[PDB]
PDB file of C-alpha atoms and ligand atoms in Angstrom:
ATOM      1  CA  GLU A1251      19.784   1.484  -3.569  1.00 42.31           C
ATOM      2  CA  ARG A1252      18.057  -1.839  -2.809  1.00 38.16           C
ATOM      3  CA  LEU A1253      18.946  -4.831  -0.633  1.00 37.75           C
ATOM      4  CA  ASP A1254      18.327  -8.386  -1.827  1.00 42.04           C
ATOM      5  CA  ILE A1255      16.881  -9.774   1.405  1.00 40.34           C
ATOM      6  CA  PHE A1256      16.403 -13.378   0.179  1.00 44.22           C
ATOM      7  CA  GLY A1257      15.068 -12.483  -3.300  1.00 41.50           C
ATOM      8  CA  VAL A1258      12.964  -9.578  -2.060  1.00 39.40           C
ATOM      9  CA  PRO A1259      14.390  -6.162  -3.040  1.00 38.90           C
ATOM     10  CA  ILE A1260      14.016  -3.674  -0.136  1.00 38.73           C
ATOM     11  CA  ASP A1261      14.584   0.016  -0.881  1.00 38.67           C
ATOM     12  CA  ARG A1262      17.119   1.562   1.515  1.00 35.92           C
ATOM     13  CA  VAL A1263      14.897   4.421   2.588  1.00 38.74           C
ATOM     14  CA  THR A1264      14.092   6.351   5.778  1.00 35.27           C
ATOM     15  CA  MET A1265      10.489   7.442   6.595  1.00 32.58           C
ATOM     16  CA  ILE A1266      11.228  10.985   5.223  1.00 33.97           C
ATOM     17  CA  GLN A1267      12.776   9.580   1.995  1.00 34.17           C
ATOM     18  CA  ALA A1268       9.868   7.112   1.527  1.00 32.87           C
ATOM     19  CA  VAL A1269       7.317   9.959   1.801  1.00 32.07           C
ATOM     20  CA  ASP A1270       9.274  12.105  -0.725  1.00 31.68           C
ATOM     21  CA  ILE A1271       9.369   9.168  -3.180  1.00 32.94           C
ATOM     22  CA  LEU A1272       5.563   8.803  -2.957  1.00 32.78           C
ATOM     23  CA  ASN A1273       5.061  12.559  -3.499  1.00 33.37           C
ATOM     24  CA  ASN A1274       7.238  12.273  -6.648  1.00 31.24           C
ATOM     25  CA  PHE A1275       5.148   9.284  -7.869  1.00 31.24           C
ATOM     26  CA  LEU A1276       2.110  11.673  -7.870  1.00 31.42           C
ATOM     27  CA  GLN A1277       3.898  13.780 -10.527  1.00 29.16           C
ATOM     28  CA  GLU A1278       4.314  10.753 -12.889  1.00 30.07           C
ATOM     29  CA  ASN A1279       1.247   9.856 -14.986  1.00 31.25           C
ATOM     30  CA  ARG A1280       1.422   6.052 -14.581  1.00 29.97           C
ATOM     31  CA  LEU A1281       0.508   3.391 -11.964  1.00 30.36           C
ATOM     32  CA  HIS A1282       3.130   2.837  -9.267  1.00 32.86           C
ATOM     33  CA  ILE A1283       2.781  -0.209  -6.978  1.00 31.65           C
ATOM     34  CA  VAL A1284       4.040   0.290  -3.407  1.00 34.47           C
ATOM     35  CA  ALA A1285       4.636  -2.516  -0.852  1.00 36.60           C
ATOM     36  CA  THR A1286       5.912  -2.454   2.759  1.00 33.98           C
ATOM     37  CA  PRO A1287       7.590  -5.830   3.341  1.00 32.19           C
ATOM     38  CA  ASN A1288       8.371  -7.021   6.853  1.00 30.49           C
ATOM     39  CA  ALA A1289      10.459 -10.175   7.642  1.00 29.86           C
ATOM     40  CA  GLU A1290       7.261 -12.331   7.610  1.00 27.31           C
ATOM     41  CA  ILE A1291       6.488 -11.223   4.035  1.00 28.16           C
ATOM     42  CA  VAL A1292      10.071 -12.190   3.060  1.00 29.26           C
ATOM     43  CA  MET A1293       9.397 -15.727   4.448  1.00 28.44           C
ATOM     44  CA  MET A1294       6.075 -15.929   2.580  1.00 29.60           C
ATOM     45  CA  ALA A1295       7.833 -14.985  -0.702  1.00 28.94           C
ATOM     46  CA  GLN A1296      10.167 -17.995  -0.302  1.00 29.36           C
ATOM     47  CA  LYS A1297       7.244 -20.427  -0.618  1.00 29.37           C
ATOM     48  CA  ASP A1298       5.037 -18.338  -3.045  1.00 25.19           C
ATOM     49  CA  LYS A1299       6.620 -17.952  -6.593  1.00 25.21           C
ATOM     50  CA  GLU A1300       3.828 -15.570  -7.718  1.00 23.55           C
ATOM     51  CA  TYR A1301       4.251 -13.278  -4.668  1.00 25.51           C
ATOM     52  CA  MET A1302       8.049 -13.304  -5.141  1.00 28.94           C
ATOM     53  CA  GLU A1303       7.650 -12.188  -8.836  1.00 24.98           C
ATOM     54  CA  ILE A1304       5.244  -9.428  -7.675  1.00 24.50           C
ATOM     55  CA  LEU A1305       7.667  -8.145  -5.000  1.00 26.01           C
ATOM     56  CA  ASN A1306      10.400  -7.886  -7.667  1.00 25.20           C
ATOM     57  CA  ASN A1307       8.063  -5.787  -9.911  1.00 27.01           C
ATOM     58  CA  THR A1308       6.913  -3.060  -7.465  1.00 29.83           C
ATOM     59  CA  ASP A1309       7.997   0.598  -7.704  1.00 27.35           C
ATOM     60  CA  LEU A1310       8.855   0.853  -4.004  1.00 25.97           C
ATOM     61  CA  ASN A1311       9.372  -1.712  -1.237  1.00 23.20           C
ATOM     62  CA  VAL A1312       9.550   0.231   2.032  1.00 25.19           C
ATOM     63  CA  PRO A1313      10.854  -1.917   4.931  1.00 24.17           C
ATOM     64  CA  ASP A1314       8.349  -2.624   7.749  1.00 21.66           C
ATOM     65  CA  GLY A1315       9.187  -3.022  11.450  1.00 24.98           C
ATOM     66  CA  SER A1316      12.419  -3.545  13.371  1.00 27.22           C
ATOM     67  CA  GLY A1317      12.785  -7.184  12.311  1.00 28.52           C
ATOM     68  CA  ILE A1318      13.829  -6.647   8.671  1.00 28.72           C
ATOM     69  CA  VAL A1319      16.156  -3.784   9.789  1.00 32.51           C
ATOM     70  CA  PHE A1320      17.843  -6.157  12.292  1.00 31.89           C
ATOM     71  CA  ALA A1321      18.247  -8.839   9.567  1.00 30.78           C
ATOM     72  CA  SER A1322      19.753  -6.219   7.194  1.00 31.10           C
ATOM     73  CA  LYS A1323      22.756  -5.885   9.598  1.00 31.16           C
ATOM     74  CA  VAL A1324      24.312  -8.755   7.542  1.00 31.29           C
ATOM     75  CA  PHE A1325      24.721  -6.270   4.593  1.00 30.63           C
ATOM     76  CA  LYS A1326      27.541  -3.766   3.935  1.00 28.89           C
ATOM     77  CA  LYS A1327      24.980  -0.937   4.037  1.00 29.41           C
ATOM     78  CA  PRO A1328      22.183  -2.002   6.459  1.00 28.44           C
ATOM     79  CA  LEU A1329      18.684  -0.415   6.442  1.00 29.07           C
ATOM     80  CA  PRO A1330      18.896   3.170   7.681  1.00 30.11           C
ATOM     81  CA  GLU A1331      16.039   3.229  10.207  1.00 29.15           C
ATOM     82  CA  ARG A1332      13.022   1.361  11.566  1.00 27.87           C
ATOM     83  CA  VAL A1333      10.004   2.326   9.480  1.00 30.74           C
ATOM     84  CA  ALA A1334       6.397   1.297  10.218  1.00 28.84           C
ATOM     85  CA  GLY A1335       4.184   0.926   7.119  1.00 27.72           C
ATOM     86  CA  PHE A1336       1.210   2.235   9.122  1.00 31.98           C
ATOM     87  CA  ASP A1337       3.176   5.409   9.982  1.00 31.81           C
ATOM     88  CA  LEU A1338       4.195   5.758   6.300  1.00 33.41           C
ATOM     89  CA  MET A1339       0.532   5.679   5.235  1.00 36.26           C
ATOM     90  CA  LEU A1340      -0.493   8.349   7.803  1.00 34.05           C
ATOM     91  CA  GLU A1341       2.500  10.602   7.101  1.00 34.33           C
ATOM     92  CA  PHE A1342       1.783  10.337   3.334  1.00 34.51           C
ATOM     93  CA  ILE A1343      -1.953  11.116   3.930  1.00 32.66           C
ATOM     94  CA  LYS A1344      -0.967  14.010   6.276  1.00 31.97           C
ATOM     95  CA  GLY A1345       0.994  15.707   3.464  1.00 29.94           C
ATOM     96  CA  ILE A1346      -1.493  15.215   0.613  1.00 29.31           C
ATOM     97  CA  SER A1347      -4.567  16.168   2.740  1.00 30.24           C
ATOM     98  CA  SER A1348      -3.804  19.889   2.305  1.00 27.04           C
ATOM     99  CA  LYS A1349      -3.038  19.415  -1.442  1.00 25.93           C
ATOM    100  CA  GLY A1350      -6.530  17.987  -2.194  1.00 26.89           C
ATOM    101  CA  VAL A1351      -5.226  14.677  -3.629  1.00 28.65           C
ATOM    102  CA  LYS A1352      -8.066  12.164  -4.312  1.00 29.34           C
ATOM    103  CA  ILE A1353      -7.875   8.932  -2.182  1.00 32.48           C
ATOM    104  CA  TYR A1354      -9.881   5.668  -2.396  1.00 31.56           C
ATOM    105  CA  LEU A1355     -10.143   3.152   0.452  1.00 30.12           C
ATOM    106  CA  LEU A1356     -10.658  -0.449  -0.644  1.00 30.92           C
ATOM    107  CA  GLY A1357     -10.603  -3.254   1.891  1.00 30.04           C
ATOM    108  CA  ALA A1358     -11.561  -4.408   5.461  1.00 29.71           C
ATOM    109  CA  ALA A1359     -14.902  -5.855   6.746  1.00 27.62           C
ATOM    110  CA  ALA A1360     -18.258  -4.093   6.188  1.00 27.68           C
ATOM    111  CA  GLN A1361     -18.218  -0.433   7.324  1.00 28.27           C
ATOM    112  CA  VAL A1362     -14.547  -0.417   8.483  1.00 28.36           C
ATOM    113  CA  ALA A1363     -13.362   1.606   5.420  1.00 25.60           C
ATOM    114  CA  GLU A1364     -16.241   4.132   5.951  1.00 25.95           C
ATOM    115  CA  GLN A1365     -15.286   4.484   9.652  1.00 29.22           C
ATOM    116  CA  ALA A1366     -11.602   4.913   8.732  1.00 28.53           C
ATOM    117  CA  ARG A1367     -12.583   7.627   6.191  1.00 24.45           C
ATOM    118  CA  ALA A1368     -14.583   9.443   8.924  1.00 26.40           C
ATOM    119  CA  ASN A1369     -11.632   9.291  11.369  1.00 25.24           C
ATOM    120  CA  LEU A1370      -9.132  10.430   8.667  1.00 25.44           C
ATOM    121  CA  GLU A1371     -11.345  13.463   7.915  1.00 26.75           C
ATOM    122  CA  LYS A1372     -11.211  14.369  11.678  1.00 25.06           C
ATOM    123  CA  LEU A1373      -7.413  13.881  11.955  1.00 29.44           C
ATOM    124  CA  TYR A1374      -6.433  15.548   8.658  1.00 26.98           C
ATOM    125  CA  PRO A1375      -9.210  17.989   7.668  1.00 27.52           C
ATOM    126  CA  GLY A1376      -9.426  18.664   3.949  1.00 26.49           C
ATOM    127  CA  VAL A1377      -8.431  15.113   2.941  1.00 30.27           C
ATOM    128  CA  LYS A1378     -10.222  14.201  -0.304  1.00 31.26           C
ATOM    129  CA  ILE A1379     -11.403  10.578   0.155  1.00 29.13           C
ATOM    130  CA  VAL A1380     -13.513  10.102  -3.025  1.00 34.17           C
ATOM    131  CA  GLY A1381     -14.851   6.655  -2.092  1.00 32.96           C
ATOM    132  CA  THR A1382     -14.676   3.477  -0.001  1.00 32.97           C
ATOM    133  CA  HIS A1383     -15.650  -0.203  -0.382  1.00 32.91           C
ATOM    134  CA  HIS A1384     -15.197  -3.338   1.766  1.00 34.16           C
ATOM    135  CA  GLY A1385     -12.696  -6.004   0.660  1.00 33.36           C
ATOM    136  CA  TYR A1386     -15.082  -8.963   0.492  1.00 32.64           C
ATOM    137  CA  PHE A1387     -16.387  -8.188  -3.023  1.00 32.51           C
ATOM    138  CA  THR A1388     -17.419 -10.569  -5.795  1.00 31.64           C
ATOM    139  CA  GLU A1389     -16.152 -10.291  -9.436  1.00 33.48           C
ATOM    140  CA  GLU A1390     -19.354  -8.433 -10.369  1.00 34.14           C
ATOM    141  CA  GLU A1391     -18.727  -5.910  -7.516  1.00 36.06           C
ATOM    142  CA  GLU A1392     -15.008  -5.664  -8.486  1.00 35.67           C
ATOM    143  CA  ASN A1393     -16.053  -4.408 -11.953  1.00 33.94           C
ATOM    144  CA  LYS A1394     -18.162  -1.624 -10.447  1.00 34.74           C
ATOM    145  CA  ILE A1395     -15.395  -0.809  -7.899  1.00 34.46           C
ATOM    146  CA  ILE A1396     -12.580  -0.416 -10.516  1.00 36.36           C
ATOM    147  CA  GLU A1397     -14.912   1.801 -12.599  1.00 35.92           C
ATOM    148  CA  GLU A1398     -15.751   3.884  -9.493  1.00 37.36           C
ATOM    149  CA  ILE A1399     -11.997   4.272  -8.664  1.00 38.95           C
ATOM    150  CA  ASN A1400     -11.114   5.388 -12.222  1.00 37.03           C
ATOM    151  CA  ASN A1401     -14.204   7.547 -12.858  1.00 37.55           C
ATOM    152  CA  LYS A1402     -13.918   9.370  -9.509  1.00 37.79           C
ATOM    153  CA  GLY A1403     -10.352  10.338 -10.591  1.00 38.67           C
ATOM    154  CA  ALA A1404      -8.653   8.799  -7.543  1.00 39.36           C
ATOM    155  CA  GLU A1405      -4.847   9.201  -7.526  1.00 39.48           C
ATOM    156  CA  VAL A1406      -4.043   7.128  -4.388  1.00 38.45           C
ATOM    157  CA  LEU A1407      -5.598   3.691  -3.696  1.00 40.09           C
ATOM    158  CA  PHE A1408      -5.076   1.969  -0.336  1.00 38.14           C
ATOM    159  CA  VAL A1409      -5.825  -1.728  -0.558  1.00 39.34           C
ATOM    160  CA  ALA A1410      -6.514  -3.262   2.873  1.00 40.10           C
ATOM    161  CA  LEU A1411      -6.829  -7.005   1.949  1.00 42.35           C
ATOM    162  CA  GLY A1412      -3.828  -8.405   3.862  1.00 43.85           C
ATOM    163  CA  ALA A1413      -0.641  -9.856   2.371  1.00 43.39           C
ATOM    164  CA  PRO A1414      -0.259 -11.402  -0.189  1.00 40.34           C
ATOM    165  CA  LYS A1415      -3.920 -10.859  -1.258  1.00 41.34           C
ATOM    166  CA  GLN A1416      -3.611  -7.056  -1.596  1.00 41.10           C
ATOM    167  CA  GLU A1417      -0.407  -7.261  -3.687  1.00 40.22           C
ATOM    168  CA  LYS A1418      -1.858 -10.034  -5.818  1.00 37.62           C
ATOM    169  CA  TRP A1419      -5.062  -8.004  -6.377  1.00 35.61           C
ATOM    170  CA  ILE A1420      -3.166  -4.801  -7.340  1.00 36.61           C
ATOM    171  CA  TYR A1421      -0.835  -6.735  -9.657  1.00 36.05           C
ATOM    172  CA  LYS A1422      -3.674  -8.706 -11.378  1.00 32.48           C
ATOM    173  CA  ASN A1423      -5.439  -5.366 -12.012  1.00 31.95           C
ATOM    174  CA  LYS A1424      -2.430  -3.101 -12.776  1.00 32.47           C
ATOM    175  CA  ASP A1425      -3.595  -2.638 -16.375  1.00 28.37           C
ATOM    176  CA  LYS A1426      -7.181  -1.760 -15.287  1.00 28.22           C
ATOM    177  CA  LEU A1427      -6.429   0.680 -12.443  1.00 27.41           C
ATOM    178  CA  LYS A1428      -5.864   4.277 -13.537  1.00 28.51           C
ATOM    179  CA  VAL A1429      -4.469   5.550 -10.189  1.00 26.12           C
ATOM    180  CA  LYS A1430      -0.925   6.932  -9.669  1.00 25.27           C
ATOM    181  CA  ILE A1431      -0.186   4.966  -6.463  1.00 24.07           C
ATOM    182  CA  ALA A1432      -1.702   1.596  -5.412  1.00 25.65           C
ATOM    183  CA  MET A1433      -0.427   0.547  -1.953  1.00 24.67           C
ATOM    184  CA  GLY A1434      -1.282  -2.548   0.125  1.00 26.79           C
ATOM    185  CA  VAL A1435      -2.002  -1.468   3.725  1.00 22.98           C
ATOM    186  CA  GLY A1436      -2.975  -4.796   5.419  1.00 20.27           C
ATOM    187  CA  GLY A1437      -4.840  -4.256   8.684  1.00 16.01           C
ATOM    188  CA  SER A1438      -4.408  -0.448   8.791  1.00 16.18           C
ATOM    189  CA  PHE A1439      -8.146   0.094   8.200  1.00 16.14           C
ATOM    190  CA  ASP A1440      -9.056  -1.790  11.410  1.00 14.91           C
ATOM    191  CA  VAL A1441      -6.524   0.308  13.342  1.00 14.36           C
ATOM    192  CA  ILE A1442      -7.680   3.637  11.847  1.00 13.47           C
ATOM    193  CA  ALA A1443     -11.403   2.852  12.321  1.00  8.02           C
ATOM    194  CA  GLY A1444     -10.701   1.759  15.910  1.00 10.43           C
ATOM    195  CA  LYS A1445     -11.780  -1.882  15.380  1.00  7.87           C
ATOM    196  CA  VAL A1446      -8.246  -3.066  16.367  1.00  5.71           C
ATOM    197  CA  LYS A1447      -5.285  -1.910  18.587  1.00  8.86           C
TER     198      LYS A1447
HETATM  199  C1  UD1 B2673       2.657 -10.879   9.569  1.00  7.03           C
HETATM  200  C2  UD1 B2673       2.232 -10.435   8.204  1.00  7.03           C
HETATM  201  O1  UD1 B2673       2.551  -9.341   7.752  1.00  7.03           O
HETATM  202  N1  UD1 B2673       1.455 -11.274   7.521  1.00  7.03           N
HETATM  203  C3  UD1 B2673       0.227 -11.856   8.016  1.00  7.03           C
HETATM  204  C4  UD1 B2673      -0.962 -11.465   7.129  1.00  7.03           C
HETATM  205  O2  UD1 B2673      -0.838 -10.138   6.716  1.00  7.03           O
HETATM  206  P1  UD1 B2673      -1.988  -9.144   7.226  1.00  7.03           P
HETATM  207  O3  UD1 B2673      -1.782  -8.889   8.679  1.00  7.03           O
HETATM  208  O4  UD1 B2673      -2.080  -7.977   6.300  1.00  7.03           O
HETATM  209  O5  UD1 B2673      -3.291 -10.053   7.055  1.00  7.03           O
HETATM  210  P2  UD1 B2673      -4.766 -10.060   7.669  1.00  7.03           P
HETATM  211  O6  UD1 B2673      -5.556 -11.057   6.882  1.00  7.03           O
HETATM  212  O7  UD1 B2673      -4.696 -10.244   9.148  1.00  7.03           O
HETATM  213  O8  UD1 B2673      -5.296  -8.576   7.355  1.00  7.03           O
HETATM  214  C5  UD1 B2673      -6.374  -8.502   6.399  1.00  7.03           C
HETATM  215  C6  UD1 B2673      -7.045  -7.146   6.425  1.00  7.03           C
HETATM  216  O9  UD1 B2673      -7.819  -6.982   5.209  1.00  7.03           O
HETATM  217  C7  UD1 B2673      -9.180  -7.293   5.449  1.00  7.03           C
HETATM  218  N2  UD1 B2673      -9.585  -8.405   4.563  1.00  7.03           N
HETATM  219  C8  UD1 B2673      -9.057  -9.666   4.694  1.00  7.03           C
HETATM  220  C9  UD1 B2673      -9.335 -10.658   3.836  1.00  7.03           C
HETATM  221  C10 UD1 B2673     -10.199 -10.410   2.722  1.00  7.03           C
HETATM  222  O10 UD1 B2673     -10.575 -11.247   1.901  1.00  7.03           O
HETATM  223  N3  UD1 B2673     -10.673  -9.116   2.641  1.00  7.03           N
HETATM  224  C11 UD1 B2673     -10.369  -8.073   3.478  1.00  7.03           C
HETATM  225  O11 UD1 B2673     -10.835  -6.954   3.320  1.00  7.03           O
HETATM  226  C12 UD1 B2673      -9.337  -7.583   6.943  1.00  7.03           C
HETATM  227  O12 UD1 B2673     -10.594  -7.168   7.440  1.00  7.03           O
HETATM  228  C13 UD1 B2673      -8.091  -6.880   7.517  1.00  7.03           C
HETATM  229  O13 UD1 B2673      -8.273  -5.470   7.603  1.00  7.03           O
HETATM  230  O14 UD1 B2673      -1.213 -12.386   6.077  1.00  7.03           O
HETATM  231  C14 UD1 B2673      -1.507 -13.745   6.487  1.00  7.03           C
HETATM  232  C15 UD1 B2673      -3.005 -13.904   6.454  1.00  7.03           C
HETATM  233  O15 UD1 B2673      -3.398 -14.550   5.252  1.00  7.03           O
HETATM  234  C16 UD1 B2673      -0.865 -14.184   7.811  1.00  7.03           C
HETATM  235  O16 UD1 B2673      -0.549 -15.572   7.714  1.00  7.03           O
HETATM  236  C17 UD1 B2673       0.407 -13.375   8.084  1.00  7.03           C
HETATM  237  O17 UD1 B2673       1.028 -13.726   9.312  1.00  7.03           O
END
């Protein structure tokens, strides 16, 4: 059940339902692209044709913030509840930390993804974070990074490059990445590492 909020399909999910969908994606041997659009992303999509095509080709668009939920009141079946994409990422990580699911952290300025990894290992002990890399890489570094992601057998890839850059990166490389879930997480690395509020 999806809502066409100005071209952008938003899945009518609650935080519990969104986490169950991601856990089911881990059982399917194929790449699933996950996005968490907020009202600002919907406005960006209006001016960016490429981003709009990407948002209509993702496996799951979880709504982000109160804004998009307020705007959905125009529909016959509005969005069930306010869902924060940051909270979705931590709830998802909380569940798979005990199951030993391999995670890769790509994105943020130098050392932020290593600091986030350290903090995640303190919050959810047993989390398997197989690798990290900053999001200011060159094409030559990108080649080594995709090989590291695939060869380390990572199942979940969090891309912290900001929107639309993270979606555009995941989509450009969908045929190269051998992970089960690739999700754009924006500035969540700065928040987890403690760089930002
Ligand atoms: C409100 C919203 O949802 N969208 C904002 C944002 O999303 P978003 O808030 O995700 O964008 P930011 O650029 O502020 O977040 C980028 C994050 O990725 C990292 N980083 C950034 C760039 C890069 O090349 N590599 C990298 O690793 C940063 O260190 C940070 O952790 O996108 C645009 C920035 O272009 C803004 O105009 C939008 O208002």
